[PDB]
Amino acid sequence: AEMRARERRDRLHEALSVNRSRVNQLEKQIAFCEA
Amino acid sequence: ARERRDRLHEALSVNRSRVNQLEKQIAFCEA
């Protein structure tokens, strides 16, 4: 169970990092285009 | 031990909040 749990959590961490990066760039696009 | 690490935690949170606030302001200025 330990191995499966750590694998799932690691995948989720990586996905979350990607999500934060995506949000930042799309936030910049939104602000610039709206202005 | 817990007193020192806890006051360190809250100091970290304050510093990171300041960083985020200033970055948001500067991004607004840029646009």
Side-chain angles (χ1 to χ4, degrees):
Chain A
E2 179 275 325
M3 311 75 78
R4 293 300 298 142
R6 88 187 298 148
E7 288 158 16
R8 286 307 306 158
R9 304 330 180 200
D10 292 344
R11 295 302 80 76
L12 290 165
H13 277 99
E14 290 175 303
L16 174 58
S17 77
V18 171
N19 294 332
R20 298 190 235 117
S21 78
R22 180 183 65 251
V23 170
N24 294 328
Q25 295 115 28
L26 273 65
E27 277 274 328
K28 290 180 187 184
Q29 291 159 36
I30 280 296
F32 303 162
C33 70
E34 195 178 14
Chain B
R2 67 159 291 270
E3 293 159 19
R4 267 78 71 88
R5 307 319 183 104
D6 290 343
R7 70 90 179 176
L8 283 169
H9 280 290
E10 62 82 9
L12 173 160
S13 75
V14 172
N15 296 340
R16 181 256 294 152
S17 77
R18 292 172 183 164
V19 168
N20 292 350
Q21 179 62 251
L22 297 163
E23 288 180 344
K24 290 298 97 178
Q25 293 169 353
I26 280 159
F28 304 159
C29 294
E30 185 185 1

